[PDB]
Structures are given as C-alpha cells and as structure tokens.
Amino acid sequence: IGRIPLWLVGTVVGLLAIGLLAIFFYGSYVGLGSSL
Amino acid sequence: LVDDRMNGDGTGLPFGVNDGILGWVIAGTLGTIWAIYFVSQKDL
Amino acid sequence: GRDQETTGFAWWAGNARLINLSGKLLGAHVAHAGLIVFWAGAMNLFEVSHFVPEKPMYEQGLILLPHIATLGYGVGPGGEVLDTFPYFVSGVLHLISSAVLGFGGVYHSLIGPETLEESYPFFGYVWKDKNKMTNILGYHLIILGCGAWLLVLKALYFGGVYDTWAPGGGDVRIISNPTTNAAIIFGYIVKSPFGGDGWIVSVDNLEDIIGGHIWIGTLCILGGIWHIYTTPWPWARRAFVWSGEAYLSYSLAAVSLMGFTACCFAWFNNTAYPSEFYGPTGPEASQAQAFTFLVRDQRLGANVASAQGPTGLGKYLMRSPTGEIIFGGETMRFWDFRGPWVEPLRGPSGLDLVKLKNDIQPWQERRAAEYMTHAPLGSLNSVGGVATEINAVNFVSPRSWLATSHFCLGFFFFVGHLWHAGRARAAAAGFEKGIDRVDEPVLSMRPLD
Amino acid sequence: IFTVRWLAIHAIAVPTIFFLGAITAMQFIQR
Amino acid sequence: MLTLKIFVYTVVTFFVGLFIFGFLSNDPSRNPGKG
Amino acid sequence: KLPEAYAPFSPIVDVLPIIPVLFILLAFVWQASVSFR
Amino acid sequence: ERPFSDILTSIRYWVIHSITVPSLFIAGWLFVSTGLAYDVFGSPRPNEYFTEDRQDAPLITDRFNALEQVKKLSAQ
Amino acid sequence: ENTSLWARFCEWITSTENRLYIGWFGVIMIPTLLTAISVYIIAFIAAPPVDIDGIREPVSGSLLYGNNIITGAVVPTSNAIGLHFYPIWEAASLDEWLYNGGPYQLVVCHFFLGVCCYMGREWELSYRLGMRPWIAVAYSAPVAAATAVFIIYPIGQGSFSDGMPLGISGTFNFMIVFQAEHNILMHPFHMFGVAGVFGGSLFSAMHGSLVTSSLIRETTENESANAGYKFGQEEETYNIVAAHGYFGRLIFQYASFNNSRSLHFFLAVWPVVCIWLTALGISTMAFNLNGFNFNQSVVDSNGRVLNTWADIINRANLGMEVMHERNAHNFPLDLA
Amino acid sequence: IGTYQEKRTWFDDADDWLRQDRFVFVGWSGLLLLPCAYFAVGGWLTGCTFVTSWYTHGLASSYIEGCNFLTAAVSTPANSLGHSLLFVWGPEAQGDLTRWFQLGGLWAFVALHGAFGLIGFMLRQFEIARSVNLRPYNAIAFSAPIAVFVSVFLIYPLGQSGWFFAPSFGVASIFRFILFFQGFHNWTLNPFHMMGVAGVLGAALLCAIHGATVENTLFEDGDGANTFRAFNPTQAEETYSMVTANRFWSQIFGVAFSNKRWLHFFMLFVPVTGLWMSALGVVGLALNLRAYDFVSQEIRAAEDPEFETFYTKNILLNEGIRAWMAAQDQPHEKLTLPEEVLPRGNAL
Ligand code: CLA
Ligand code: CLA
Ligand code: CLA
Ligand code: CLA
Ligand SMILES: CCCCCCCCCCCCCCCC(=O)OC[C@H](COP(=O)(O)OC[C@@H](O)CO)OC(=O)CCCCCCCCCCCCCCC
Ligand SMILES: CCCCCCCCCCCCCCCCCC(=O)OC[C@H](CO)OC(=O)CCCCCCCCCCCCCCCCC
Ligand SMILES: CC1=C(/C=C/C(C)=C/C=C/C(C)=C/C=C/C=C(C)/C=C/C=C(C)/C=C/C2=C(C)CCCC2(C)C)C(C)(C)CCC1
Ligand SMILES: CC1=C(/C=C/C(C)=C/C=C/C(C)=C/C=C/C=C(C)/C=C/C=C(C)/C=C/C2=C(C)CCCC2(C)C)C(C)(C)CCC1
Ligand SMILES: CC1=C(/C=C/C(C)=C\C=C/C(C)=C/C=C/C=C(C)/C=C/C=C(C)/C=C/C2=C(C)CCCC2(C)C)C(C)(C)CCC1
Ligand SMILES: CCCCCCCCCCCCC/C=C/[C@H](O)[C@H](N)CO
Ligand code: OEX
Ligand SMILES: [Cl-]
Ligand SMILES: [Cl-]
Ligand SMILES: [Fe+2]
C-alpha cells in the first residue's frame, strides 16, 4: 500500500501506451500494409 | 456591347466604391450617426 | 505553485492561478517563447538534415526552409538551393537562443520574484493600470516596428528577398525604390476580399510588399511612442473592459484574424510564397493543366483557338465573364491567377494567341512539374492526388499543410476569444461564478406574456 | 481473491495483452 | 442599377454605424450585476 | 543534409522536434505528482 | 476493499505482474512468429495467396460442399 | 436617458422587456437574416434555371420550374463567376443575375453574417440576464459547420459553385461529390463528428431516461397527482441520487457522474467539440487535405494487389468521380 | 411473498446471490448478456486480428494481412451460402473450426451473439431498474438501438440474397455498406432515413443546448472560481435557474422549455423516434422497396433534354456507383464488364 507512487505507475503505463502506439504507427510504413 | 454594365467587379476599388457618391453617402451616414451619438452620449 | 482551495481554480485551469502573479506570469511567457524558438531551431535542423538537394524544396515536407529561402539566403537564380549553411546557422542560433529563453522562463517560474511591484516598479503592473498597459503595449509596438524595419533593411541594403516576377523564372533580387504610396498601401488594405481583388492576398510585387512593410514599421514605432506618452481616452475607457483576460481576448481575436489571413496567403499568394519553394497554389497547376494541354495539342497540330469542347465553350481557350481571353477548361474559376510563367504570355486583351503560338518559352514549358504532380491535393496519410488515387507518390503540398493547420488553429483561437471575452465581461460584471440565487435579475423583470 | 471482479478484469486484461503482443509481433512481419 | 448600390450602401453603413456606436455607448455598464 | 562536422549529430537532431509535445505531457506528469491539488 | 488505488501502488501487485504480462506478450509474439495464427485461424501467408491454377480472387460458389471446396482451393 | 433620441434608442435596443431580444448584435442579425429569408423563399418558389457549372447547362431547383420540396434547391453560384462577389448591381439585368447564381451568394453572405450576429446576440442576452456567456461558445460549432460548407469550402476550391446547395437533393449531391473527391468517411475528423452526433443522441437518451425515471410521485395516471398539494409549493420533486446509483450499477459503479454540473458539462462539451472537429475536417478538405488513402496498401509477397474494403470504397468513389459534372471537364486530372 | 410462509427453494438462494451489489452486477440477465457480449466483442477482435476474408469476399480484412483498425473487419459469408446460420457443427463447416473461420462463420457467430447480448443488456436494464425501483425508460430508450441492429444486421440481409449483403463488422466495411445503400437504394432520398437523420441531429442539438444552458445557469452555490465543487447532492434545491433559462431561450429562440419533465422526455423521445423511423426505412429497403425515383421528374427529364435537377445528378451518381462498384463488390455475379460499357463523364 503506497510503496510505489500511483502517479509514477500511471506515468510508466502512459509511456508504454505511447510507445505501443508509436510502434503501431511505425508498422504502417514498413512490412505488411506499407503499400510497398 | 449589347447592354450597359457597372463594370466595377474587380479592379481593387477602395471599399468597393466606383463613384464619389458612394463614398459621400457612406461618410454622411456615419457622420450623422456619430453626430447623434455625440450630442446624445452619456445617457443624458 | 498553489492549490485549488486557496486560488479557486482547478488544475485544468491552473494557468489562471497566475493571472495576478506578475513574476510567474512573466516566467510562463518567457518559457513559452523559449518553446517557440526551440521548435523553430529544432524543426529547422530537422528539415536541413532531411534535405535532398536535387529535389525542389516542397516534395520533402519542408515548410520553414522555404521561409528562409524567400529572404534570399542560399537561393540560386532559377530557384536552386546552392547551400544549406544559412539554414543551418538559423537553426543553431534559434536553438541556442531558445536555451537562453528557456533558462530565463524556468528561473522566473520557479525561483523568480512571485510579484513584481514590491521590488521592481518598472516591471510591476496591475491589470487596471491603463497607463502602464499602454506603456507595455508601446514597448512591444516599437519592438515590432523594429522587426518590420529589419525585413525592410534586408530587402533594401543586404541584397536579399527572392522575386518570382524577375525575368527567367525569378532571382534573388535586391529591391530598389519600394512603393511607399499611401494610396496604394491603403487601397490594398481597404479593398474587397473576394475573387476579383483579394483583400490582403493581392501583393504581386516585392516593391509593394516592402513599401507596406515600411509603412507598418513606421506606424508601429509612432504608435508605440504614442502609447508610451498617452493614457486611454474616456470613450475608450467606457468602451473597453480593463482586465487581464479581456486583454487576452482582444489579442485572441486579432491573432485568429491573423491566422485566417495567413491561411489565405498560403493558399493564394505566389509572391510572398514563391512557387519554387512552396509548390503550386490552388489556382496554378489547374491553370498549368490547361496551358500544358493547350501547348501539347497545338504541338500535335490541332488549333486551340477554334477548338470547342463538349459544351461548345472551348476545350483550350474561352472568354472570362469580362472579355479577357482565358483558359477554356473548368479552370475558368481560376482566371485571375497571375504567375511568372503566365504574364509574359499574357497581353492587354487576353492570353495573346500569337504569343501562345510562337512566343512560348522553354522554361515555361519545363514548368510542367507545377501541373504534373504537386497540385495541392494529397490526402492526410500522404499518397498521391485526388482521394481515388493509389499509393504511388509520397507528396502533400506544404501550402495545403500550413493552410489547413492555420485555418484550424485560427478557428480555435476565435473560439478561445469568444470564451475569454465572455468570461472577462462576466468577471467585470460580477457573475462569473453564477447567479446570486437570492436576487436574480429575472424576478425583477416583467414577464414576456 | 478470484471473485467476480477478478474474473471480469482478467477476462478483459489477459486476451488484450496477448493480442497486443501479437499485433506488436505483426508490426515487423514483411512480405 | 447604380442607385440600388447607393441605397444598399446607405443601409449597410446605417446598420454598421448603429452597431459600432451602440457598442461604444456604455455597453459594459448594461448589466444587472453589481459592477 | 547537415554539414560534414555535424553529420554524426543528425540522428540526435531527428528526435528534437517532439520535445515541445513532451513538455505539455511533462506538465501532466507534474500535476499527477502533486496529485492534481 | 482494495479500491484499485492501493493495489497498483503496492509492490505485491508488480512482483507477480513482472512475469505474467511479459509472458503473455511473449506468448502472443511467438503465437504470431511460429505461424500458429495462420494455422489456427486459416489466414493465408503472403506467399500463399495465389495458387498456380487460379490467379484471381477465389469464389466459394457452393453451400453444402463448401468445406470440401474450400479445402480444394485453399493453400493446401 | 429619457429625453434623448440616441438614449431612448439605446435602452430600447438593449431592453430585456422585448418579446425577442434585439441588442447591438440583433441590429445586424435581423436585417441580414430577414433579407436572406426573403430572397431564399422567393428563389425557392420562382427562381429561373441557373447555370451552376459555367457550361451553359442550367438546372432548375425551383418549384414553379417543375420540382418538389425534396428536389427543390436554391442552386449555387455559377462556376464561371468563381468567388468574384456577384451582387445585383454587378449584373446588367435581374434575368442575368438570376441566370448566374446571384441569389445563392446573397443568401449565403447574409446567412453567415446573421448566424455570427445570432451567436453575438446569444452572448448579449446572457450578459444582460446575469447569466454565464458560453452558450454562444456552444453555438459556435454549428456556425463553424455552416461557414465550412457555405464559405470556407468555396474559398478553398475557388468557386461558390462548390458551396452546398440550399436544398435537400442539392445537399445530397454536395455530399456525394465531396465523398468522391475527399474521401470524407476515411477522414478522422469526420469520424470524430459521426461519433459526436451518435454519442450526442446516446447521451441525450441516457440523460432523458435517467431524469424521467428518477421521480417521486407528483404526477399520477391522470394529468397530475396534486392531491398531496396543488400548485404553489417549493417542495421539490425529482432525484439524482438513485439515478446515479442506477447508472453506476449499469456497468461497474466506478465511472462516477454524481456531479450534475460535471455531467451537464460533459453533455455540452462532447457534441460541441466533435462538431468543431468535423467542421474543421471539412475546412481542411477544402484545401484538399482529404481523408485516408489506403488504396493498394495490402500487397502479397509477389506484389499482387490484394483487394480491401478500402479498395471497394475506392471503386465506389471513382464511380462517383466519373459521374460528377459529366460535361464540365475538358482535361483528365481534376484539379479545379 | 404477499404475507405467506414461502418455504425456500434453490431459486431464492440463486436470486439472493445474483441480486447483490458487486464490482459488476450480474443478475439473471448476466447468464445471457455476459457470455454473449464477451463472445461478440472477442470474436470481433479476433476476426479483425487473425481471421481473413480472402475466402468469401476475395479481400484482406485482418491485421495479419496488413490492414488497419479502420480497415480490418469481420467479413460476411459468401452469397452462395445464402442465409445459412453457419454453425460450427452445421453442414457447411462440419465441425472444422479453421475452415469455419475461412467460410465466414465468425460473422454469424458475432451477429447472433451480439443480438442475444443486446437482449440480455436490455433485460439487465430492466432488472437494475426493478432493483432500484425506477421506471425503465433506459430500456425504452435502448429499444431503438436494438431495433436498428435487428433491421440492419438481420432483417435487411434476410430480405436480400444472403448474409453477404449484410454489414461486415468493421469501419471500412460499414463505409462500403453505406455507399452501397447510396448507389443501389438511394437511401438519402428515403423519408424514413430523413426522419432518422433529423432525430439524431436534433438529439445532438438537444444534448449540446441542455448542457450549455445548465452550465450557464449554474447559480452561485459557493465562493470559488470552479463551479463544479459548488454542487452538493445533499441539498434539495435545484442546481440551475430554470426561470432564467426559460427567459433566455424565449427571447433568443422564441420558444423555451418550462417543464423539466417535458424537456427530458423530449430528450428521450427525439433519438428513439428517429432511430425507429430509420429502422422502418431499412425494413422497407430489405425488400428493395426503395424511394429511389420521382416519376414526374424522370418523365419530365425524359421528354426534356434541358430539365436537370440535383436529384437527376444524384440518380446519375448512383448509376456510376452501381456500375463501377458491382464488379469488385459482388464476386459471385462474375461481372466481367468491359470499361467501355461502364458510364463515364467527360475526360475523367
Ligand atoms: C506553455 C506551458 C506551460 C508553462 C510555461 C507553465 C508555467 C507555469 N505553470 Mg502551468 N500548466 C500547464 C502549462 C504550462 N505551465 C498545463 C498544460 C497545465 C494543465 C495540466 C498546467 C497547470 C498548472 C497548475 C495547476 C499550476 C501551474 C503553475 C505554473 C507556474 C509555476 C509552476 C510551479 O511553481 O511549480 C513548479 C513546477 C515544477 C518544479 C516542474 C517543472 C519543471 C521545470 C520548470 C520544467 C521542466 C524542465 C525544463 C526542461 C528545464 C529547462 C532547462 C533550462 C536550463 C533550459 C508557471 C509559471 C502553478 C501556478 O499557477 O502558480 C501559482 C500551478 O499550480 N500550471
Ligand atoms: C522598453 C522595455 C521593453 C522592451 C524593449 C521589451 C521587449 C520585448 N518584450 Mg517585454 N515587457 C516589458 C518591457 C519591455 N519589453 C515590461 C515592463 C513588461 C511587464 C513585466 C514586459 C512583459 C513582457 C512579456 C510577458 C513578454 C515580453 C516579450 C518581449 C519581446 C517580444 C518581441 C519578440 O519576442 O518578438 C520578436 C522580436 C522582434 C521582431 C524585434 C526584432 C529585433 C529588433 C531589431 C531589436 C529592437 C531594438 C530596438 C532599437 C530597441 C527598442 C527600444 C525600446 C525603448 C522599445 C521583446 C524583445 C515577450 C517575450 O518574452 O519574448 C521573449 C513576452 O512574452 N515582455
Ligand atoms: C504550423 C504547424 C505544422 C505544419 C503545417 C506542419 C507540417 C508538416 N510537418 Mg510538422 N510539426 C509541427 C507542426 C507542423 N507541421 C510541430 C508543432 C511539431 C513538433 C511535434 C512537428 C514535427 C514534425 C516532424 C518530426 C515531422 C513533421 C513533418 C511535417 C510535414 C509532413 C506532415 C505529415 O507527415 O503529416 C501530418 C501529421 C498529422 C496531420 C497528424 C495530425 C495531428 C492532429 C492535429 C491531432 C489532433 C486531432 C484531435 C484534435 C486529437 C484530440 C486529442 C487531444 C485532446 C489530445 C509537413 C509539411 C515531417 C517531415 O516531413 O519532416 C520534414 C516530419 O517527420 N513535423
Ligand atoms: C494564447 C491563447 C490563450 C491563453 C493565454 C489562454 C489562457 C488561459 N485559458 Mg484558454 N483557450 C484558448 C486560448 C488561450 N487561453 C483557446 C484558443 C481556447 C479554445 C480551444 C481556449 C479555451 C479555454 C477554456 C475552456 C478554458 C481556458 C482557460 C484558461 C486559463 C487557464 C488555462 C489552464 O491552465 O488550463 C490548462 C491547460 C490544459 C489542460 C491543456 C489543454 C489541452 C487542450 C484542450 C487539448 C489540445 C492540445 C493538443 C496538443 C492540440 C491538438 C491540436 C489542436 C489544434 C486541437 C488561462 C488564463 C480556463 C479558464 O477559463 O480559466 C479562467 C478554461 O476553462 N481556455
Ligand atoms: C429571431 C429569432 C430566431 C428564431 C425564430 C425561429 C424559431 C422557430 C420556433 C421553433 C418552432 C416552434 C415549435 C412549436 C412547438 C412548441 O411551441 O411547443 C412548446 C414547447 C414549450 O413546452 P413547455 O415547456 O410549455 O412544456 C410543458 C407543457 O407540456 C405544458 O404547457 O416548446 C418546446 O417544446 C421547446 C422548443 C422546441 C422547439 C423545436 C423546434 C422545432 C423546429 C420547427 C421547424 C419547422 C419546419 C421548418 C419550416 C418549414
Ligand atoms: C475613401 C477612403 C477610405 C479610407 C478612409 C477611412 C477613414 C476612417 C476614419 C475613422 C477614424 C475615426 C475613429 C473614431 C472611433 C470612435 C471614437 C468615438 O468613440 O467618438 C466618441 C467620442 C466620445 O467623446 O467623441 C470624440 O472623441 C470625437 C472623435 C471622433 C472623430 C469624429 C470623426 C470626424 C467627424 C466628421 C463628421 C463626418 C460628418 C458628416 C460629413 C458629411 C459629408 C457630406
Ligand atoms: C515552467 C513550467 C513548465 C514549462 C517548462 C519549460 C517550457 C521549460 C523549457 C525550456 C526550453 C525552451 C529549453 C530549450 C532548450 C535548448 C537547449 C537545451 C539547447 C541546446 C544546445 C545543443 C547542445 C545543441 C547542439 C547541436 C548543435 C549546436 C547543432 C548540431 C546539432 C546539435 C543538436 C548537436 C511546465 C510546462 C513543465 C510545467 C509548469 C512549470
Ligand atoms: C505590411 C504589408 C502591407 C501593409 C499592410 C497594412 C498597412 C495593414 C494595415 C492595417 C490597419 C490600418 C488596420 C487597422 C485596424 C483596426 C482594427 C482592425 C480595429 C478594431 C476594433 C474593433 C473590432 C472594435 C470593436 C468595438 C466597436 C465596434 C465599438 C465599441 C468598442 C468595441 C471594442 C466593442 C501590404 C499589404 C501593403 C504589402 C505586404 C505587407
Ligand atoms: C473467437 C471465438 C471465440 C471467442 C473468444 C473470446 C471471447 C476472446 C477474446 C479476446 C479479446 C478481448 C481480444 C482482444 C484484443 C484487444 C486489443 C487488440 C486491444 C487494443 C489495441 C489498442 C490500439 C488500444 C488503444 C487504447 C485505447 C483506445 C483505450 C485506452 C488506451 C489505449 C492506448 C490502450 C471462441 C474461442 C470462444 C470460439 C468462437 C470464436
Ligand atoms: C498617432 C501617431 C503619432 C506619431 C507621433 C508620436 C508622438 C507622441 C506624442 C504623444 C502625444 C502627447 C499627448 C499627451 C497626453 C497627456 O498625457 C495628456 N493629454 C495630459 O493632458
Ligand atoms: O465544380 Mn464542383 O467540383 Ca471542385 O472538382 Mn473539379 O471542380 Mn468540379 O470538379 Mn470535382
Ligand atoms: Cl478541366
Ligand atoms: Cl454532379
Ligand atoms: Fe437536467
């Protein structure tokens, strides 16, 4: 209870979600579905 | 030409006026409203 | 900072908590200015690093390298780039200046003086001090007049600014004898905003551009001195609301008008925004389609003056609403387009049939990259032209980008002006928080029916 | 725990994480 | 047809003048709130 | 491209535009850290 | 009552979630990378779209023998 | 203040005792909107055929020229005109002005000024009633959409013929051509707007259900249950305590909307910001920013085009494209 | 019940367990809604991720092939399958799951489970409203999304040739369905669709106006600049000035609401009525009973080469949609139409 800050947890989850969305947007320009 | 036309579309006319009468009626109307407001401002 | 229990503003309105804090307000401003100059330097360095020299400076998604290139920094005769060192120098100088500004903004936001009046009376200001606010406005007006005169100096004495209307396809041309005619400048500012004229997007020459800049710089300096040495008149006091929120709303309305106006410059102007750097405008590539198809179909052998379309109006040439001879396609809406590759081909009456037949120039023929791709279509995820085009070419027009974005942000800033003007009026009246519930104005009014 | 909250939360969370890993893997698949 | 332009210009100038001078004529004081 | 004395720093340059986007998110991190007081 | 604020802060949550979440991510990664997604859900590989016999879009054009036919015109 | 002409005019204009508030924004709203109403009605009833595409091929759009309410429309201005400001005094005759599409320009300009002054008048009445002023900010979204479809899109495309026709079938025509040339369905701002109207209907139904359901007895199966007490008491009916409990138990009882002010702020902000987004999507597609283009994005190992739902949308879009303006194009690539 | 002994059975214990306050309410309706809805959303997310559409439609509509979120979809079965329910055990799949995915059976799975999930959800609305002793106006309002879903995903394909002409569960799939209704049915010209459009637009307008009006008549109720904390659920007074709101809208619009009862009933009424009218219109379209043409207009334009309207333009656009969309839209029809018989304008 309160060992790791909740704002720190939410911030780390936010960077992970932003990075996952960045990978998803980068994959639209490479590989399958890249129109090339 | 087969008809009379204003021929004022374009040519960069200031405020769209092509005759002096338009500028004069604009100035006269604005001056009349300004005069009424000036002699009748501050409520009283 | 502070909490909501003392300031009364929630976190999503936290910048309101520093309305009455002069030092923190100044720190927020200086940090934000550092943000602007940081974007300028970083995006300039990004565009320089992502610059391919053989391609023109619009197939690469570059928007501000054309802004430096218009000033004449590293631009060849025809429109080539020559060198990117001025662009690199501009980016690095902006980055270092942004570092300095960010340090100052962070300092004044964190450990600067909380309120400026008790220690620095020159910089301290209450929002109800009309003389002090006009003093600050005068300082900024003199600064902006000096900024406009800096562009004037660059055009006049430092051998700069690129002219598209120079013969041969433009050149970096030092400007001599700018038109400082008050009739010309103010006839530009008071004329119609529609297709025949265009209110502010009508400058066809750098002489009128620099004359207007001379006028705006001199007027800004004089108005700055005037605001320094005056106090607002009683009619202005009765007309305006004197608060920091009302001043913000005035600035928001003015800057939203500027945003819409800049969107219109971007879409239509090809003089302050050269086609060699920004790509074709809306009217061109459409005029270029008709022009290139006319010259191609008369190169095959078919005459273009006596050729009519399916509707009997002319596949290549027709007449405008006024008796000028214009291009006969659907581009009859864009018959007002003025381009450097059109005017020597154009005469007093119309498009000069004899000039179309004989006096066509090879560089005007080679200016078919205007038409080919690069018409300001392009889709949101790049791809080619119209919405039904396939994934072939990676291009969207920079004019399209910084017209669409600027219209979006201009409309948002008009909305913000509405919000802040209303809240400032409600704050000055006394009911920004709601109705007093014991004496509401409605119960003191007669019913409608 | 293993209550209704645990079951619903994990029935949403586990396949979403599995599918997200699958999609991140499919981002690097090339023809 | 020129007189139509004159009449419309007079009407528009009239209404715009009413707008501007009415907002000049003590608009922030036309409130029920104390202030 | 960047000049020859700055070519190795171009990959560092390629990330610099997104810092202003990171700034408003930094403000949101600070609000989360002060628990949105 | 564990109102979802104390558990996310506690380290007991993240001790057992430093293995389960990455293991699920790796499981999905291997599920894709081993071709098991293709084998299970029947999606063709990028090299398994056109057989030598037919070079156009496939058509089912049957109902009661649809299983046999799709086994016939699938990627073997 | 009582014996002065401009005084009596000012406290008649700003008076809150009028049946409809006029105000200083109303002194501009009323004449422009009355002019637009008169010209729109007269044109819809008896407008002669007008050549919209600048190709000497007029369309009727008016009831006395043989069409109904659904297919009648005040047709946009001629393509030959462009956005060149064609009023009556710039014509040699009324017949010529009508043949070139001047009624559309008149109605659109007056309507834009009228809706802007209607927003200003909403602010003015909120100010004169001691209210809060952001009802005008909420109204700024339909005004933005009308400006985008009547002014901004013709500015971007270069001709008022690109404006939305003042009608129903003309609106559908504008929609289909806009689809063909900008792929509005695959535009994220348009998806935000569609989600906004769908969620606006959703939230309107939810709010109506929660407030109409959470009651204590004051209206019986008859007109009213006044047997407890008649009209003239401040003992309030309604509930928002059990309604929030019902809404919480509906899904998971943690998405707390117990604040009525926050709930109503969400109801105000969601469709307004989404209509802002879709209006700006139209304004961006005016400058041909267009929607998503995923045509032939999916290719196999050998590079053959695998068909796609986006490709089917592309086929429908190009089928629309070849039909639009069958006679108005002389050159292959559609740029103007 | 009703002052009776009522010896307890298994039903009383089951009812007591199901009707309890938890993180998520289950109830009797949760025996249907929770599995059916979970399976519908999971099947849609699985089909958008792994299940292809190459066999049935001849196109790629999944993440494993290179499609986006706006592009991948759970596609309908082939038209030759007709209105087959497409069970796994059925005569089509014959108990083979990996071919059942290839045969478009996931669409039928998702559609049937979504229909039963909607049934279970509005049953859950009934059960929760009965537990908290409130009128089921939420269920009455939710009857219109159920009607739209039934008429669109069930009644229209049952009226047509097969499930192939149903909406595939996706984004670009729904856009295809919408453009198909434009080109083949003239769905904008349908008065029922016009009523539905009016209902949705008026409902969004009502939501925005009501929210703005309440937020702009909020009373003082405090001293801070944030009005949101000025609200107290304990107090028995209204949080906004209905008299001020009524006078404002009476002097702005001419008419205004005077009853909160009527205001919120209208807010309930407009979108439900609009969606029900649109459902009736889609039912009319299920049998191709479309308001496609205006006979007087078409005869007038047939005998007059000059008469043109925007409706005639729309008819011409619909012809092009049909002609240029059918060949790649319906692979069962085998429309190998050459390019010259397809209609064209000039130069495009
Ligand atoms: C342009 C963006 C911007 C800027 C310049 C500011 C600036 C400021 N805000 Mg603010 N804010 C913003 C956005 C911004 N804000 C946004 C988007 C929100 C909504 C989430 C808020 C919500 C908010 C609230 C609720 C409050 C402020 C407050 C403040 C002021 C003091 C902060 C403080 O005292 O605590 C200290 C903050 C920190 C210690 C963390 C910041 C770390 C540094 C300063 C920046 C990051 C490092 C940076 C890279 C250093 C540069 C290095 C240099 C050498 C170049 C300050 C002037 C406070 C205020 O109003 O004063 C009364 C206040 O309470 N803001
Ligand atoms: C005479 C006093 C003075 C001067 C010279 C300035 C000058 C400036 N202020 Mg400042 N200000 C002042 C007083 C003054 N202020 C006071 C008393 C206050 C209240 C505390 C403020 C509050 C304030 C705020 C909140 C902000 C500024 C900002 C700025 C800068 C805006 C210009 C810009 O960045 O765009 C571009 C610059 C140009 C286009 C000019 C081109 C360069 C020319 C050639 C130099 C001009 C030299 C000229 C001969 C000297 C001017 C003479 C002087 C007497 C006016 C600018 C350099 C903004 C800022 O932070 O910017 C960093 C800002 O946000 N000021
Ligand atoms: C005046 C604003 C402006 C304009 C006109 C441009 C224009 C351009 N940029 Mg640029 N950029 C800008 C600002 C701008 N940028 C800013 C502020 C940054 C800092 C982050 C960048 C950083 C940047 C990079 C790194 C790159 C570009 C690139 C480009 C070029 C291609 C853009 C593209 O690929 O698609 C455009 C992208 C979009 C249209 C994304 C849409 C984002 C919208 C606005 C989100 C909002 C939607 C909605 C409201 C969301 C609500 C959620 C919210 C509440 C959180 C193009 C010419 C690329 C290039 O060519 O290099 C030279 C490139 O790589 N830009
Ligand atoms: C230079 C212009 C400017 C300035 C100085 C201010 C200043 C201020 N505004 Mg304001 N505003 C502006 C423009 C401006 N605004 C515009 C253009 C709009 C319309 C969109 C608004 C709408 C607005 C509202 C509704 C409110 C304020 C409020 C405030 C006050 C507190 C701000 C705060 O801390 O919120 C915190 C900041 C944030 C939480 C970040 C905002 C995130 C936005 C909404 C998402 C978009 C960001 C994204 C990156 C951009 C996507 C692309 C875009 C084109 C859509 C403050 C004094 C508040 C107030 O009234 O206090 C008195 C408040 O209620 N403003
Ligand atoms: C310059 C001012 C600009 C505004 C003028 C235009 C506004 C027109 C007035 C709205 C219509 C009046 C509605 C009558 C119905 C009416 O008067 O009902 C009266 C009703 C008031 O209800 P109460 O609050 O009194 O309800 C309690 C009662 O049950 C007990 O008396 O008004 C409303 O329902 C709220 C407003 C709804 C208004 C809906 C708008 C309908 C659009 C109409 C479009 C017509 C077709 C197009 C024309 C061809
Ligand atoms: C064709 C060229 C086109 C471009 C030219 C455009 C020129 C526009 C110049 C307008 C500038 C006036 C600013 C006043 C703003 C309101 C001041 C006020 O609230 O004023 C109120 C204020 C309160 O004390 O009073 C005062 O300070 C009095 C100061 C106001 C000055 C009065 C203007 C001069 C009056 C001349 C009368 C015109 C009479 C009719 C002429 C008929 C011709 C046949
Ligand atoms: C107050 C505040 C805030 C704000 C902040 C800010 C805004 C900050 C900033 C800042 C800034 C504004 C910064 C900037 C900077 C810059 C820098 C730091 C720089 C630099 C330098 C360098 C080092 C470079 C180098 C180079 C060159 C020279 C060229 C080549 C390349 C390279 C890159 C290498 C926030 C929101 C958070 C929250 C609230 C509080
Ligand atoms: C540089 C340049 C140029 C120049 C320009 C100029 C010169 C400009 C200007 C301008 C100007 C000269 C402006 C002015 C202005 C003003 C304004 C814009 C205003 C205002 C305001 C308002 C809006 C008001 C309101 C009100 C009223 C109505 C009354 C009462 C009070 C109040 C406030 C309410 C040129 C183009 C040549 C060339 C290129 C560049
Ligand atoms: C098929 C089938 C089935 C069913 C199954 C199930 C029921 C499951 C599942 C599942 C699931 C359930 C999955 C999932 C997925 C998910 C995902 C893939 C996600 C995502 C993505 C994204 C992109 C996101 C984003 C976001 C948002 C929007 C929100 C917040 C923030 C974030 C950023 C996170 C069985 C076997 C029975 C048999 C029959 C058939
Ligand atoms: C409007 C452009 C003017 C260009 C020249 C600027 C010169 C600046 C002179 C400032 C005028 C001084 C007026 C003095 C005002 C005093 O504060 C009060 N009238 C004292 O009674
Ligand atoms: O006019 Mn109506 O619309 Ca704008 O695109 Mn080109 O031109 Mn026409 O085409 Mn598609
Ligand atoms: Cl053409
Ligand atoms: Cl058409
Ligand atoms: Fe309510």
Ligand code: NA
């Ligand atoms: Na054609």
